[PDB]
Amino acid sequence: NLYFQSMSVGFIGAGQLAFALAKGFTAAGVLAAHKIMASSPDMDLATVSALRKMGVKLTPHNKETVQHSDVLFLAVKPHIIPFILDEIGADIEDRHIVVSCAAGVTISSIEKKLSAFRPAPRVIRCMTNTPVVVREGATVYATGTHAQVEDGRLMEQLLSSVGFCTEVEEDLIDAVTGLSGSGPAYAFTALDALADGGVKMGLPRRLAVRLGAQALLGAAKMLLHSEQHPGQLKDNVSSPGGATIHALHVLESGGFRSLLINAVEASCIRTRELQSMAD
Amino acid sequence: SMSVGFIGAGQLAFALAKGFTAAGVLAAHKIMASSPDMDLATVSALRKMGVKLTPHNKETVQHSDVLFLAVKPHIIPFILDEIGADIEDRHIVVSCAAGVTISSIEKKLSAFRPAPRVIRCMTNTPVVVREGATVYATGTHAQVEDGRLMEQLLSSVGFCTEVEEDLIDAVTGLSGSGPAYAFTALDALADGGVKMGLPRRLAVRLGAQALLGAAKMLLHSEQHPGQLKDNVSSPGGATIHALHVLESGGFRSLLINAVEASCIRTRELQSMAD
């Protein structure tokens, strides 16, 4: 029974993430679409067209988003953030909570830019992922220097309506980016390959995609609702000498586990590397 | 009414001049190319087509309105110092050299006359069959009509779109080097056909036709390349068995490696220039 009646939300940037969050927020019923505004310099985007059909207000002018909004999501690519902050810094007011969703971009770099215009900008940094669009996101956030305690509580309330959400220290966010930020892409890759495996063994592609996705969804839910180690859940599937343990062996023979560690590491390191180039 | 020149009379200049004249947008007599070796195979070819040839880059500049630089990247600075005093208000200088930045070209030419009109492009050899892939970036002093003239000319020999200059090194790694990746693949596919009993000539023809048709399908489709792949393979069938052996060798990762390596080498060469 959650609903933010006095809250206006804006998105600077109207792409994949702004669409996913706006769709998730409106489906959760915590925000009416007409209380959301998004800005983009390209109104011929498929996400812009989708946001319009939801009822979200659209404008080319970032200043209009700022003037409309209380909670302001920065949903542009990381290298665009400093340009955005230069553009609307003079328009940030005491009432604004600035939530940066940009990969890698530090609270410090945002606060430095905005502080040149008005002291004490209220800044929150978050890392989320596209499954907020089906209200099953994974979101972490860190509060900035001037964020009030009620600001973090409000953001956790809002972002919990579209999936898991918890506060972290900011120095964990680049690693979260490599795990759950990039994570859905690892899963989409895995599901494409599992479906290819099903097709190879005789299944129609449509059925293979449905079954592989249901298997992943079910297993993830089991782990979330269980207190047992994933190794123990794995042990429950494989009967001695059976089909599953034969398949697990071929995964191990290819270093399957190491590839996933490699992936989380590479996304995290690239996230750190990009920000060091920014600074 | 346009007059076009090429500094350099090698593979790219031939490919572009053959495409332009085949497209009809340019008559061979409006094209002049220069090279210090007038006994080159490509120079002989351009002569048969009707293109004017000269050893003197100054003559090419004097006749051209649009001037293409089609020499190797390390030669661009030498060329710019030889012809810089000959550039005029009318000239559009189109650099085709891999890696060479608009800034480096504009710096050299500005020592002689301010506001040189510079465009940088990355194209590829299939312009010779009017199926090239071309991107271009406009310089500080290019007029808006300069970019439109450029896009009109290069669209006649393939795909053409404007990009920001900071994308061009990556384009080089993808569509600039791309034809070589395809020629390697076609040689190997033909070897596979021969191993399974096909005459070499038929294998080359079938492999090339298969790649051409698939590329055309993807260009004409709004569907994802993975969806088009799913349409080929029946469950349990021959295609999905072959796709597995490609995946087992990391086929996808090799092509990613290639684009990266070409792009990185392009960036590395230009850092050496600067």
Add this chain to the structure above:
Amino acid sequence: SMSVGFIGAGQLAFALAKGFTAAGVLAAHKIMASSPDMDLATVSALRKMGVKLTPHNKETVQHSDVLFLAVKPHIIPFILDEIGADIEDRHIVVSCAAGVTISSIEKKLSAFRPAPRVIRCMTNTPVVVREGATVYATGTHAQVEDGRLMEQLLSSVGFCTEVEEDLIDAVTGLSGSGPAYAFTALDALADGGVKMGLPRRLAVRLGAQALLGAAKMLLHSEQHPGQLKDNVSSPGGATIHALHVLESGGFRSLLINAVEASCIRTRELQSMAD
């Protein structure tokens, strides 16, 4: 004046009917296709084009002069037992099924009427953009004009040549499965473009255009694919660096592996049929 039927209304039947009608060689109303699932996506598409649809394979046979079999290979014997008593002296039966031999088809149809006119072909999905690659072999009772009619029809949607039947399983591994190899390559090349900073849409477009143009160059050239590769790479340049990383992963061997695996699976499936 020709009437064409398809038994099966799936991906291949759609692709061939779209190519035929786009080529102008066949009006959509002269084509009938049958399928047991009239709520298929491809069946809806054929209906929009003007193709006649029916659930009854007998109706397709009754209207067709040329009859394409475009069902999965394990279904061919079932189809031949359902329609065998309906084949006539006028019919040319064109089997498109992977692996299925002319001998197996002629044996089944001969139980009903002697001298069935049978042609086996291997084509691919790019017939839908009239750039298919098709081979065909004529059966024991096909007249000489039957092969010429077949080549005329299939040349309208791509390359077409007659082969001995014992080459068709290898052709399957090369140009039949080939589009899937190209779609995989194009997905990966686009990923490489994105890694180096290109938007995904531009990377897909440039990669596909590069492969299309290179394939067209090879088809229009008498030069060896290795010679065309040599023309792309400058000494020390970006392309030769990328070619090295392809060679280091055994890129060529993977494509040979793929053709072999598809051909072998085709042979294996037909041995299972027999």
Add this chain to the structure above:
Amino acid sequence: ENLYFQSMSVGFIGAGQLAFALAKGFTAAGVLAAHKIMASSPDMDLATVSALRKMGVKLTPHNKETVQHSDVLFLAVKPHIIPFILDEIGADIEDRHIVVSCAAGVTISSIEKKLSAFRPAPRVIRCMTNTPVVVREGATVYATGTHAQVEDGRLMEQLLSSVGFCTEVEEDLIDAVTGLSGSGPAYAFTALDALADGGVKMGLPRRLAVRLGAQALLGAAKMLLHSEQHPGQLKDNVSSPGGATIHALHVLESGGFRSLLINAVEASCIRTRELQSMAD
């Protein structure tokens, strides 16, 4: 012929494998009398020295004697020895000398800098050759230095063409030539050893396998040199569809055979550049 009646005196500083191979080639070509060649080394107990002596080449421990004897003077010592050599006999280089450095990686610039401290216009040529000059099938490139006369390059090409292929190049290609044709014979000997092992594994006597493998390589190389066709086209002409050769080419491809040869040319070229950076 014309070079023979030129009665050239040749010297080698260094009496090792390259000096032996060149001396053997020049004398077998009839361009030089063995006794018009002089070679020096501090180690007069080397096998190459005994072979040179048996040939009739003049041997001396004293590099100055080689210089004074010579009209064309080959520097055939290890790359890191070249600067010591140039310090030692630099004062003995005369205006009549053509100094030909064979040393891997050593630049014309580095040599001219040493020698210019003594006479102002030392005539320097840099070359890269290989051991098959010993059977007059060498592969040789050379670049002319700042003060080499046009006749000096032509004389050098005449001389080195008598023992194989020879062509002028820009100096900045020579490190790459080193990795290809300089080191190349060692790749070929490795390949010939391995091909012979393959012959032996399949049942051939070793002597026959070595002979057939070497003859195969020689004939294939000669074909390519005498053909205007691409090596891939010549390869295509060997393999029938489904046949033995295309099966063998597949297993080469599956091992990255091509990439190994690229790796080798690269590795030798890079090592050549890396040593010279250590020098300069």
Add this chain to the structure above:
Amino acid sequence: NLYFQSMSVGFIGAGQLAFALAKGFTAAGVLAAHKIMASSPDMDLATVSALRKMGVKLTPHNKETVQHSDVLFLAVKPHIIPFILDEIGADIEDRHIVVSCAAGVTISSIEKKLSAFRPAPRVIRCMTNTPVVVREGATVYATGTHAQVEDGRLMEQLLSSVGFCTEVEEDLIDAVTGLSGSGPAYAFTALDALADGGVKMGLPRRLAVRLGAQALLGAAKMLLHSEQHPGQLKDNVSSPGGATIHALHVLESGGFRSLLINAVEASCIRTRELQSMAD
């Protein structure tokens, strides 16, 4: 000063090998081109066009080649040999020496076919390679049951005019096929790759191809003219710590030697496998 004045040579098959041998024989001066006849069912072949320009007599009819010829080379693909022998078996005469160049095809299988028409066919089996076209071939031959001692001597004389030639026991020929029969293709592959290596390091392709080919030619000649082991010749190239030994290491790290053994083995095994399918 060799010349076979009373010898007429025929080729059944007018493809790559017939062209290479006819070009080699005529360049050696041991045969006039007009004393050579070749037959093929396809007179629109590039090799047929090349043979015509040399002066070689051409016919579509294999029977004409047989009637013209004394020495008859079978230069068709191995699976065509039994069809050929059926076709012209009745036309073999006492004077004919039948030389089969077909990979894998045994003397026994040829003699069995031809003996059904006339006893004691004179059969020689040979394995050669395309460098006979530059008179640097590598050829072995085995004499059949009814070949006279002068027949082998004559064939060794003829084939020695286009390269190395020696007699072997027939059971060595499949292995020779894997080594020197297929060998030129291994070399063309190696030269293409070496040239790519030169281009990568800055050489023009034309120069790189010329230098790589000269290097291989020179090294092979050195080995042929030396009594030393190839390992010893290799040692003479590499100075301690130098460029060559660095390159040899990277070849060894990739198992370069094993790939060449693999190749000879695979060609030999395929040659045996094909013939077992023939029989």
